[PDB]
Amino acid sequence: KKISGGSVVEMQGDEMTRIIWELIKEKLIFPYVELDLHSYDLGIENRDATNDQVTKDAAEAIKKHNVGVKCATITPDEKRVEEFKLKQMWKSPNGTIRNILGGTVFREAIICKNIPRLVSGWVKPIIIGCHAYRATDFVVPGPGKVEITYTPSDGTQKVTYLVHNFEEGGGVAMGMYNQDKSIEDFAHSSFQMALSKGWPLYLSTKNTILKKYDGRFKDIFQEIYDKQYKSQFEAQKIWYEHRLIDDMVAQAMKSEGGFIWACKNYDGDVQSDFVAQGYGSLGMMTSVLVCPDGKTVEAEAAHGTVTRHYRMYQKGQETSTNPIASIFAWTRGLAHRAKLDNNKELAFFANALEEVSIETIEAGFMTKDLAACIKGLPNVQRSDYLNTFEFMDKLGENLKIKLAQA
Amino acid sequence: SKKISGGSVVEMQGDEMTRIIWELIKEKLIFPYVELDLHSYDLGIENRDATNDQVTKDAAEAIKKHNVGVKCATITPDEKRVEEFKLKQMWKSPNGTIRNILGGTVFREAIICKNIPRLVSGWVKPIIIGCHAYGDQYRATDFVVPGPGKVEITYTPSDGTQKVTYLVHNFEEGGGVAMGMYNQDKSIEDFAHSSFQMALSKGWPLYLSTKNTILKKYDGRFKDIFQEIYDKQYKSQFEAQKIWYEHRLIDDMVAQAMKSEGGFIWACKNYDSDFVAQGYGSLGMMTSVLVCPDGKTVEAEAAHGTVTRHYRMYQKGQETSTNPIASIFAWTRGLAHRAKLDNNKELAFFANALEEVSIETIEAGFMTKDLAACIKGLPNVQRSDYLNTFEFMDKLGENLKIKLAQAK
Ligand SMILES: NC(=O)C1=CN([C@@H]2O[C@H](COP(=O)(O)OP(=O)(O)OC[C@H]3O[C@@H](n4cnc5c(N)ncnc54)[C@H](OP(=O)(O)O)[C@@H]3O)[C@@H](O)[C@H]2O)C=CC1
Ligand SMILES: NC(=O)C1=CN([C@@H]2O[C@H](COP(=O)(O)OP(=O)(O)OC[C@H]3O[C@@H](n4cnc5c(N)ncnc54)[C@H](OP(=O)(O)O)[C@@H]3O)[C@@H](O)[C@H]2O)C=CC1
Ligand SMILES: Cc1cn(C(=O)c2c(-c3c(Cl)cc(Cl)cc3Cl)noc2C(C)(C)F)c2cccc(/C=C/C(=O)O)c12
Ligand SMILES: Cc1cn(C(=O)c2c(-c3c(Cl)cc(Cl)cc3Cl)noc2C(C)(C)F)c2cccc(/C=C/C(=O)O)c12
């Protein structure tokens, strides 16, 4: 018979990822695992029909049942409103979920022997927890004074800081904020991730410029480390250090990998997603939202719905979309369920499906993006890769063989 | 004569290792072939602390007048430097001083050698990045929120007839941090002009990257000012050179850039960042040019610093192998621009020829230890794999004399 998997919250998504999602469930999960599935459909049409209520219901479900696996969803813009005749420009499902849950998004690239990484010297994995949104910006119509003030709730002295005197013309201005509690949750999630994985932890800031804003992140991380985690770290022969972002980038590129990287960047900096997308590895980038309690987890692929591949599908073209990131959303959620429920058999399945994914690619069977990452797109021939369905069939066949042994 | 007359050039001498290289470049590669109306300003620490950092302001004013400046790397004072030299004051960075007197935008550009691998292997043409270094994080007002309370940001016009209060956040429990940021329309306009000038000068498409999906008003202001300035002052000239300008969301632009062959100008709104070249290869190949919005005035300098690590070894007497390329290209780029302002065809040829000889010298196997490490990996560099600082200047000079012979 199949494995008892327990309580898992699933969120169905949109376009090309929605197709891969069902393929993953039908071919890789349901043949081997029964789940008490709390399933919510976050397709753009069902969100429109429930006035986004389904999205909020799903977040509440994740918080109740501790484990969510999410499929990529369409975040509406002006064009999606026209495309789907939406009632209004619904806010992002990911923003809504993360707002309800809190926690820290951790990004990790999946490593295969035969896929070169962004930096050749990296050997062990690297996990990036970046705190990035909720700011208020406006236009400065003309000359004038922009000030940012603080008014204590307890009636003590109101304080006023000068942002800028606009002596000539106008421009733009904005205010931004962060709560100590959010920094603290950021801190705790990161230390617990380091001890979980057994890697050292680095925090990168620009506290030479934002001495007070970024300095708060450094101070809070350091207090929490010293009082609540240093001993456990040293027990596992790991460590925590703050690093200027200027130095961290240099340190990372000369490193052998094997660390957690808590990162605090501004709202418009380059994100590891964009680079992975440029390098052609975004189909291998996993994501997991880890709440500060260590109990609740929402796993997802780091990429979006892969609209461009979906349009190819709608035009009768052959597609070769990478399903690994979405598969690891399932394996990380299920592996966490196994940890919570002490399910040895479900833990075995989660690891076994991860190994089959990696072994398959390392044996030479891969989607087009992985072949281009090896050889460069210009030299990629059809015989170098498998299409979306050929590759899912291949994973399925190897998973059945894997599990047929024990 | 047998020397080219180059015209008026403002020169700014610098500190430590780059200062040494600065004289080598002038006597080995510049002075033998080019006669300049040189306006020299010593920007070393000794003379900056000596004149209350007034030479820095005077050098900038000379640049505003003569339109061309070449600057050696300088030390930006800090707590350790103030101790080393017992400064009168922790002086502001000369680059910021100059960049604030002149305005305009800094553009960085790596120099390409067929045998020096680049950050992205698909890149075949150059890429020129210009980021807005005014306001934003560099000029931000951040503070600590001690406890519950309301943080607001207000605008009051100069006529005082109005006051607009925006709610940043209400701290319901606990404290935190907040900050305010600004940017003047003037600076954005100067940023647009300087970037349209650069794209026309190099004959490549321009992309402005912003985060205007999040900062709809803040970053949308960049997008709007660029587009209307482009439309009203440059679209005809861009189409003349079969180039174009497009705004991009930073999310997409990063991936587009990595998937392109290169050959574009990248106007960026993020400085507070191109120091992955430190960890990847060498900053010795990274040049920068401050380009004013008037399109007439520039300041060329190496994007790297004074390389104090090599100066420590130099003062002792043990050999060094410091890369002079980014410093050479500070001269060639300033001279190319002088040549453009004066219709000086011979000086222009000289500028391009010195750049070709530098690149060809490296591609032919003669290079400094930093580039030898880029190829073989630093642990594998034997002393025979590279030329020391003075050997390499000798090699470029030999090849430079040969290059200039065969054309005039
Ligand atoms: N977490 C979420 O739910 C997220 C949802 N989205 C949404 O996704 C939609 C599409 O946005 P987009 O900007 O395309 O973001 P995507 O990450 O979906 O962009 C897809 C592009 O990146 C590459 N790529 C990404 N994933 C894969 C994969 N699995 N296999 C192969 N290549 C891949 C492809 O490059 P190439 O075209 O060269 O083949 C493709 O064109 C939008 O509506 C957006 O809102 C976006 C981000 C996160
Ligand atoms: N625009 C300017 O004038 C700038 C000035 N500075 C100033 O420079 C000083 C030193 O700063 P620092 O952080 O060391 O920056 P540097 O760029 O001078 O040094 C970084 C390191 O990179 C390597 N490197 C950089 N350029 C070269 C080169 N041309 N040839 C060979 N190796 C090179 C050296 O390390 P390795 O030994 O590993 O090869 C060097 O120590 C400070 O006073 C700082 O303020 C800094 C930045 C810009
Ligand atoms: C580890 C990693 C960091 N990335 C960054 O974006 C960087 C970098 C950086 C580095 Cl370290 C090297 C290079 Cl070549 C370029 C950059 Cl931009 N500097 O800071 C960051 C952020 C802003 C995220 F903190 C990634 C982006 C995409 C995939 C990855 C993949 C990881 C892997 O294959 O295991 C990584
Ligand atoms: C072109 C270029 C961009 N750099 C950045 O820093 C990035 C990147 C980025 C890219 Cl496109 C690829 C990777 Cl792998 C990592 C990153 Cl961070 N994304 O945006 C930025 C900016 C500065 C706009 F914010 C460079 C840094 C150093 C040398 C270079 C170029 C070297 C060469 O041509 O030989 C470039």
Residue numbers in the entry:
A (entry chain A): 3 to 134, 139 to 412
B (entry chain D): 2 to 273, 278 to 413
Sentences from the paper on this structure:
Various somatic mutations to the genes encoding for isocitrate dehydrogenase 1 (IDH1) and 2 (IDH2) lead to variants with substantially increased capacity to catalyse reduction of 2-OG to 2-hydroxyglutarate (2-HG). The most common IDH1 variants in cancer cells are R132H and R132C. However, ivosidenib resistance has emerged as a consequence of a second-site mutation that produces IDH1 R132C/S280F, with 5 cases having been reported to date.
The inhibitor binding affinity (determined by non-denaturing MS) was generally lower for R132C/S280F and R132H/S280F than R132C and R132H, respectively although it is not altered for FT-2102. The most potent R132C/S280F inhibitor, DS-1001B, was also analysed in a solution assay (employing CPMG NMR) and was found to manifest tight binding to all the tested variants, with the lowest affinity for R132H/S280F (KD = 4.19 µM) compared to the other tested IDH1 variants. Consistent with results from non-denaturing MS, the structure reveals two DS-1001B molecules bound at the dimer-interface. The DS-1001B complex structure likely reflects an open or semi-open (inactive) conformation: the widths of the two active site clefts in the apparent homodimer formed by chain B and chain C as measured by distances between I76 and L250, are 17.7 Å (semi-open) and 20.2 Å (open; Supplementary Fig. 8b/c). As previously reported for the inactive conformation, α10 in both monomers is partly disordered and assumes a partial loop conformation, which potentially helps to accommodate inhibitor binding. Notably, by contrast with the structure of R132C/S280F without inhibitor, in the DS-1001B complexed structure, the S280F residues of the two monomers are not adjacent but 14.9 Å apart (closest C-atom).
